[PDB]
Structures are given as C-alpha cells and as structure tokens.
Structure 1
Amino acid sequence: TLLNGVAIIVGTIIGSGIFVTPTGVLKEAGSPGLALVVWAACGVFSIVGALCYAELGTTISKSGGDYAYMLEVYGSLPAFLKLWIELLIIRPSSQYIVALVFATYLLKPLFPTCPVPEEAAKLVACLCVLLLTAVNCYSVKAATRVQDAFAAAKLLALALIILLGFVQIGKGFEGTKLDVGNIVLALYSGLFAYGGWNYLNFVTEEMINPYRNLPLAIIISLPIVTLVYVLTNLAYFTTLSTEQMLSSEAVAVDFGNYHLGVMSWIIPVFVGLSCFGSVNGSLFTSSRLFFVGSREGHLPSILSMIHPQLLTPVPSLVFTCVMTLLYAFSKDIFSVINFFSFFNWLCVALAIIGMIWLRHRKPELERPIKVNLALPVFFILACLFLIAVSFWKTPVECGIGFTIILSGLPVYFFGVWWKNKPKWLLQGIFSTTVLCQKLMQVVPQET
C-alpha cells in the first residue's frame, strides 16, 4: 500500500547529512531566518529532482544506477566518465564525510568547549571505514544485520531532537548575507542531506505496483523530509545562538549538552550509530556498480570477482575503501561537501539533459511515466545555476576535480577504446590479475 511505500522512501532519504549540514547552511545564510528558507528550497529542488528520476527509473530501467542510463544516452566515453567520476569523486567523498561526522560526534564529549583535534578525528574516521570494510568482506550475512538495526537510530536521534525542541517551546531571522555566491554554497550544504534519491528511488516500484503511485510516494514523502529538516533546525534555533552553532563541529551535541544532563549517552551515541549505519550502507550497496561496470566491459575484470567461501566481493570493497581513505588528505568537512556537491549535481545535469535529448531523439518510447516538460526545463537550469556560480565561488576544488576527470581519458583509451594489441602487455595484465586472484582468493561470478 502507498502509506507503507512512504515509510520506505522517507527512511531512505533522511540520511546522516542532517547532523553535519545545519552549521553549513547557517555559515553561508548568515542568520536563522534564511537558513530555514534554504532548507525548504532544498526540499523543493529534491521534489523536482526525484520526479525526473521517477521517469528515468521507469523508462530505461537498466540496473546499476546512472551509468546504466549513460550507456543508452551516450555510450562509449561519457559512460566511462560517469563511472570514473562516481568511483573516484562521488562515492569516496560522501563516505569520508559521513565517516568524519561519525568521528567528530564520537569524540566531542571528550572536548566539550574546545574543537576536537583534527589529527584524531581523521584516525577515528579511518578506523570506522576499515572496520566496516572488514565486516562487509567477512560476511554479507552479518553486514545486512548491521544495516537492519541502525536505521532505527537514524530516526530515533532525529525525532528526539524535535521532541526536545517542542518542550523547549512549551517552556518558552534577518538573513544577514544575500550574495548569490554564498547562497549556492548554502544550497550545496542543504542539498547534501537529501542526497539519496538519485541512487535508490526505483526500489519502491518493486512493492508499489501502479506506475502513477510512484509519483504519489515521492510527492507525499519529500514534504515529510522537508518538515523533519525544518523542525530539527527550529529545535536548534530555539535552543542555541548563531555564535554557538558556527563554533561547534557537532551541533547536536551542543543541543544535547544543554537539555539532557545524561547528554554523553544519548545524542553522541544515537547519532554516532546512525552514521555507522550510513557508512555501512554505502559499502554494502557499492558492489552493484562494479559488477555492472565490468559486465558492460568498461571496468577491470578483477573488480568483478568474489571470494567463493564467503560470497563477498573482496577486490571491489578494498578499492572502495582505499579511495574513501585518501580523502583523509582533505582540509575541512565543508570543503569536501562543496567538492562532492559540484560533481554530484554536474552528474545529475548530464542525466536530466540526457532525458530531454532522449525524449526529442526517440519519441514515445513506451514511457510508463511522462512528466511535464515544464519541470526539467527549470531543473536543468537550476543544476547549471549551482555549477556556474561554483566555478568562480570555489575554483580550486573544481580544478583538482576536473584534473581527476581529465586523468580518465588516458585509462579510457588504454583500457577500453584503443584495445592495445601487444602480447607482452596482455600477458602483463593477465599476470597482474592472477597475482591479485591468488593473493585475495577470488573468482568470477556466474555469467
């Protein structure tokens, strides 16, 4: 039933970014009144984004995420550049961000006033990503139970903040910056918390049967998310000063330290567990992209393989993991959120541009859902708006990111398009492959 569909999507969208990003939107919006408007604007942008992905998630329907659509709309090089961006920028940086929020909140009760030491925050971020890489390598039968449990902690912590906010009101604004430059960085920080819908929204079609009911699940659910995000920000703004909320790397622990008295055992624990759940989820659900990317021939044959006694995709986890652990070289959490956001929204731009170009190029391709063109023609321009400002508001992050993208052209030619013929090269590639196979004990999946 539709009511139980909404209970799947809202619990999928809510994420862990809501525990990072309040400080982010407040830093750029200057004062609470405009921060709440940005939270709403991020909601509305997600409603328009999600319904476009309800279309792509039912017209093309090929498994594996956006890359599966790029094979139809572009093929060849742009399909590889989506896979390359998603594995070296998007999926690493959003894991490191959630691993680092975990680390700051787990440590913050030892450092109540003064900021938690970055050299320690980065090690405890790493210890979390390696421990959850090991658990996903040892057992899908265990790592599923670790995902099943902590989805409760996500909503328990976030509801507790709101009910504490209500008793604060029961006992009981200007927008001081307005530069288009900063308001795009406010939008990036607020949009990060909604950032589930492009990966997974199609899952609900396997239990909500009519194709017109999938838009109803979106249009009901994302206002519910927006309500929760606005209410949690009101819980902060009715308890904390702007001069406090900009100072703390873990704002909900400040709020928890004010109300609870038992503070150490509540908000740090329940929020920490939600982020331990979100890092786990991003590892567990990663394999799909490697299997698809190697099956369709863009990605090296070793990254398809599985350890046959445990049925866990060992080389793909170890590559996922080591990319996440290199983001420990970054300076600051909101630096990485800006970086992630640029390439995430630039990928969604290529997808929704693609959908309109496909509606033009192949008309009436049996579409179960067909949205009004008036939605994408605002939304594509909104993706372009964010990117176009960000080129000059945050140049250096885009520069190192486009350096990653351009470094994909060599490995596309060498690995896929030029198909370099020398027998010594092929025997070297084979030798490198069987070394990894022997050193991890891994074998191909059933074709």
Structure 2
Amino acid sequence: TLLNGVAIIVGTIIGSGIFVTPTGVLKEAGSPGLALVVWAACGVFSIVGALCYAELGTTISKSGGDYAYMLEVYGSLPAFLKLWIELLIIRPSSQYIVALVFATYLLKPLFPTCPVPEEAAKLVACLCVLLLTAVNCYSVKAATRVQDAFAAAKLLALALIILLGFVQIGKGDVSNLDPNFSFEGTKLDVGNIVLALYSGLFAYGGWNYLNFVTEEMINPYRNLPLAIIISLPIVTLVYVLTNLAYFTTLSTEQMLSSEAVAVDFGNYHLGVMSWIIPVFVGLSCFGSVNGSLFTSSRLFFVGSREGHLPSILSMIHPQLLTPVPSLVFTCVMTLLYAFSKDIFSVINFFSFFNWLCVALAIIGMIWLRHRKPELERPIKVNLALPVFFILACLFLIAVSFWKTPVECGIGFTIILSGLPVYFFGVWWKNKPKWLLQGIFSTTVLCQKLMQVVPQET
C-alpha cells in the first residue's frame, strides 16, 4: 500500500529515546543553535544508513536478521563474535535505558524540583522489567493487546507537547528564546560533538532490524526505498519540533538540570500537569521494553539451529507456550546493567558497539560488491553512498578512544571472553567424554525445572 508503507515505518522508528536524549545533546553541544544542528545532522545520517539496509535486506534475505546477513559473508567465529556482542551488549543495555527512563518519568512527578535518588530509580527499573518479562512468559496473545495501547500513548504525548509548544509562541513573544550563542562556539570538533551525536543517533534507531518484516507482509515490492525517504524526514521533522517546544518554554539551565524535561514543559504549561504528561510518557517507555521481549526470542531460534548457542535455549513451554528459557536469559542480562553509574554513560557504551556492528556489516557489503557479483540484487544503491557511511563511522569510533577509553576497554574485554567459549563451543574435541554426559545432564535438569520442550525438529 502506498501510504501504509510509511505509517507503519514511522511509528517503528519513533522510539521512547526522545524523552531522554534532548538533555544529552544539550550538555554536549552548549546552545540550542548547535543542538538543533545535531538533530538535523543525525537526520540525514540515518537516511543513508537505512538505504544501506534497504538493499542489504533484499539481497540475502534468509531469516534471522543482521546476524544472518553476516553469517553469509564470514560464516565462522566472526559470526559467533557478532552474536556474542548482541546478547551481552546491545540488547541488554538498550532495554535498561528505556526501563531506567520509565522510572525517572514516574518518580519525577513527586520530586518536582529535586533529583531522584540513584538507588530508587534502579529498583523501579528492575521492577518494571521483571514484571514485564513475566507477562511474556504468560500469554503472548494477551501481551500483544498490551502492545496496542502503548503506540497510541507515544503519539498523544508527542503531539500534545507540540500543540502546547505551538500556542506558547502564538500567544505572544515570538522567538521567546532566540538562543544560538554557541551555534558558532563551544565546539571542540572531536570530543563534545561526537558525544552529542551518540545521543542523537540513539534517539531513533531500529531502522536496521525492523524494516525487513515491515515491507514483507504487504509485498509492495521495491517502492519501499522511496517509502523510507518519505518517512525518515517526517521523523526528523517531529524530533526538531519537540526541541522547539523545549528551548522556548524552558531555559537552557532548567533543561540541563533536570532528568525529565517533559514534565518541566508540563509543569509550566498547565496545572493539571500530572494526569497528562508523565502518564503518556510513562506508557510510551513501558512499551519499548515490552516489544523488545517479543522480538528477543527470534534470535535464539536462529543461533541454536546453526550450531552456536547451546540448545537449552530455543525451547518452548507446553500449556500457555512462550519461549521461557530465552526470556529469562534476556532479563538477567538486562538487570546486570543495574551496576551502572550514569544513564549517558550507558548510551555512550551502547552506541560504541552498535556503530561498530553496523560498520562491519557494511564493509562486508562492499567486499560482497568486490567479491561474488550477480547475486540478484533487487535493489542496488549507488556505491558512493555506502562509502560515505563507513568513513563517517570510523570517525565515530576512532574519536571514542580519545574520549572515554575505559568503557571501550571493558567492551573489548568481554569479546575476548567470547573467544574461548567459542573454542569450547563448536571447535572443541569431544574426546574426553566426561563432559558430554554432563552437557546432557545440565540441559535436562533445566527442562525438568522449567517444563520446556524443543522445537518441532
């Protein structure tokens, strides 16, 4: 369908990171002049990235996503190393942030001018997850209705911010801020700019492993690459209009202070100010870790089938079936990031390995443009476009060792831990035979423990 290719794909890319990241670009850019440039410079950069995946999703198109696209290209311990990162780094830490933001927009309507304690925002973050991972261990068809009510709340909040931000300039005192004092200034050109970009890049993502099923179910067939070029400028439009409601109605010191900017817009604008904003921002962040648990199970079914990822996972329950050993594995790793210090220390830790996973996936496209031609590419983009993409993406990582190398130091530590469990995983000689009974011993204990049965082999 012509328009429904956009309407499905716009609500997918609008995430709940828009209620977090305006504070994080503002403290790494200085003024709203250079802050609104970062929202536009992240605007264009993600049209380039989604075109690189609009073609790469169509060439191979097996099943299993970004992992399986690299499984075709390398097909060895590079594939497991890419799998060892997403189970441990990308998928846990991005769910913690949305859970941590669900806390601070729920505990900030009763702490109006002060700061929420660190130790209490974590225990409402953990509570939100463990509550929500247990719904998905129960009825899936009940949890899918729960996915319905949170799409509507994410749009009612982001419009009511606008229509109150629209009349606030129309009531009087046009250009109530007019601040661009560091639009030419406060710019280190290496450190603070990239750190402001990581907050902007987080703000809408999921143009990578979410669009391939989005096109597939209608089969409109290769009018999708225009359908994202229509779509992603609508998202950069909404993500810039919402900052215009922030910089006018708030100040640049009231914004960088608080943790919930959306309630400061809500507090000043209206006196009801409690039934509206932290509810609608609260339901919106409550859905992005719900729907991150529907789609979490798909990865396990692909990895265990290929001989990676030992087969305790990818087993499903009897009555009221739901992938139970997988959801337990994700929620444990999610709560292991409750040992973290700052939320923008997590976004900088998340987006380091997100944007190295993306960059090697597209270097592997050029080496599949160099080597192995005639693979029936339904979509081929101009090859000058992906080399715009890598040369920027090496520029993000190479400055991220000049800036905060200790978190990337423990990030390369955890991927040297995936190397011996690779050699223990598939390369290992089953010669000593003491362990082969034990692997069967350990696995059948968990099946008796959880009541989970294998796939229909």
TM-score range, shorter chain: over 0.9
Instruction: Return the structure number with greater helix share.
Output: 1
Could you tell me how far 1:60 is from its partner in structure 2? 0.7
Partner of 2:257: helix, strand, or coil?
coil
Q: Distance in 2 between matches of 1:59 and 1:326?
A: 37
C-alpha offsets along residues 63-109 of structure 1, whole Å, 9 cap, x if unaligned? 11211111101111110011110000000000000000000000001
Q: Distance in 2 between matches of 1:320 and 1:260?
A: 40
TM-score where L is the length of structure 1: 0.98
Q: Distance in 1 between matches of 2:211 and 2:57?
A: 8
Q: Distance in 2 between matches of 1:417 and 1:154?
A: 47
* Identity fraction in percent: 100
- Greater displacement, 148-157 / 225-234: 148-157
Alpha-carbon contact 1:26-1:35 (below 8 Å) kept: yes
- Greater displacement, 107-116 / 417-426: 417-426
Alpha-carbon contact 1:211-1:369 (below 8 Å) kept: no
Q: Distance in 1 between matches of 2:372 and 2:43?
A: 31
Partner of 2:64: helix, strand, or coil?
coil
C-alpha offsets along residues 303-328 of structure 1, whole Å, 9 cap, x if unaligned? 11111112200000000000000100
Aligned to 1:273: 283
Could you tell me how far 1:264 is from its partner in structure 2? 1.3
Q: Distance in 1 between matches of 2:68 and 2:7?
A: 27
Q: Distance in 2 between matches of 1:73 and 1:141?
A: 36
CA gap 1:370/1:429 in 2 versus in 1, 3 angstroms: same
Could you tell me how far 1:148 is from its partner in structure 2? 1.7
Alpha-carbon contact 1:29-1:178 (below 8 Å) kept: no
Partner of 2:3: helix, strand, or coil?
helix
C-alpha offsets along residues 401-421 of structure 1, whole Å, 9 cap, x if unaligned? 111111100111101222443
Q: Distance in 1 between matches of 2:441 and 2:415?
A: 28
Partner of 2:136: helix, strand, or coil?
helix
Alignment size in residue pairs: 447
Of 349, 366, 372, which residue of structure 2 is paired with 1:356?
366
Partner of 1:364: helix, strand, or coil?
coil
Q: Distance in 1 between matches of 2:272 and 2:445?
A: 53
CA gap 1:43/1:187 in 2 versus in 1, 3 angstroms: same
Could you tell me how far 1:398 is from its partner in structure 2? 0.4
Alpha-carbon contact 1:6-1:220 (below 8 Å) kept: yes
Partner of 2:266: helix, strand, or coil?
helix
C-alpha offsets along residues 250-271 of structure 1, whole Å, 9 cap, x if unaligned? 1111111111211111110001
Q: Distance in 2 between matches of 1:185 and 1:96?
A: 19
Unaligned runs of 5+ in 1: none
C-alpha offsets along residues 260-301 of structure 1, whole Å, 9 cap, x if unaligned? 211111110001100111010111110000111101111110
Partner of 2:188: helix, strand, or coil?
coil
C-alpha offsets along residues 361-383 of structure 1, whole Å, 9 cap, x if unaligned? 11121000000011100101111
Q: Distance in 1 between matches of 2:187 and 2:271?
A: 35
C-alpha offsets along residues 210-255 of structure 1, whole Å, 9 cap, x if unaligned? 4431101110000000000000011101111111111111111111
Could you tell me how far 1:175 is from its partner in structure 2? 4.7
Aligned to 1:429: 439
- Greater displacement, 117-126 / 251-260: 251-260
Could you tell me how far 1:118 is from its partner in structure 2? 0.8
Could you tell me how far 1:347 is from its partner in structure 2? 0.1
Aligned to 1:344: 354
Alpha-carbon contact 1:47-1:219 (below 8 Å) kept: yes
Instruction: Map residues 30-179 of structure 1 onto 2, 5 A cutoff.
Output: 30-172=30-172, 175-179=185-189
- Greater displacement, 164-173 / 28-37: 164-173
- Greater displacement, 49-58 / 172-181: 172-181
Q: Distance in 2 between matches of 1:206 and 1:71?
A: 21
Could you tell me how far 1:207 is from its partner in structure 2? 4.0
Q: Distance in 2 between matches of 1:371 and 1:239?
A: 42
Could you tell me how far 1:155 is from its partner in structure 2? 1.1
Partner of 1:263: helix, strand, or coil?
coil
Alpha-carbon contact 1:55-1:370 (below 8 Å) kept: yes
Q: Distance in 1 between matches of 2:220 and 2:384?
A: 24
Alpha-carbon contact 1:32-1:175 (below 8 Å) kept: no
Partner of 1:302: helix, strand, or coil?
coil
CA gap 1:133/1:88 in 2 versus in 1, 3 angstroms: same
Partner of 1:190: helix, strand, or coil?
helix
Q: Distance in 1 between matches of 2:230 and 2:431?
A: 55
Could you tell me how far 1:53 is from its partner in structure 2? 0.5
Partner of 2:288: helix, strand, or coil?
helix
Q: Distance in 1 between matches of 2:445 and 2:331?
A: 20
C-alpha offsets along residues 31-53 of structure 1, whole Å, 9 cap, x if unaligned? 10111110011111110000100
- Greater displacement, 50-59 / 198-207: 198-207
Alpha-carbon contact 1:413-1:419 (below 8 Å) kept: no
- Greater displacement, 209-218 / 262-271: 209-218
CA gap 1:443/1:19 in 2 versus in 1, 3 angstroms: same
Alpha-carbon contact 1:23-1:251 (below 8 Å) kept: yes
C-alpha offsets along residues 167-217 of structure 1, whole Å, 9 cap, x if unaligned? 111113555334321101111000001111112111222245344311011
Could you tell me how far 1:345 is from its partner in structure 2? 0.4
Aligned to 2:238: 228
Could you tell me how far 1:360 is from its partner in structure 2? 1.0
CA gap 1:151/1:410 in 2 versus in 1, 3 angstroms: same
Unaligned runs of 5+ in 2: 173-182
- Greater displacement, 201-210 / 58-67: 201-210
Q: Distance in 1 between matches of 2:304 and 2:429?
A: 15
Could you tell me how far 1:392 is from its partner in structure 2? 1.5
Q: Distance in 2 between matches of 1:419 and 1:298?
A: 15
C-alpha offsets along residues 387-435 of structure 1, whole Å, 9 cap, x if unaligned? 1111121211101111111110011110122244322101111111011
Aligned to 1:384: 394
CA gap 1:218/1:175 in 2 versus in 1, 3 angstroms: farther
Q: Distance in 1 between matches of 2:222 and 2:441?
A: 52
TM-score where L is the length of structure 2: 0.96
Q: Distance in 2 between matches of 1:8 and 1:386?
A: 30
- Greater displacement, 327-336 / 209-218: 209-218
CA gap 1:131/1:419 in 2 versus in 1, 3 angstroms: farther
Q: Distance in 1 between matches of 2:358 and 2:221?
A: 22
Alpha-carbon contact 1:103-1:125 (below 8 Å) kept: yes
Alpha-carbon contact 1:2-1:208 (below 8 Å) kept: no
Q: Distance in 1 between matches of 2:218 and 2:189?
A: 43
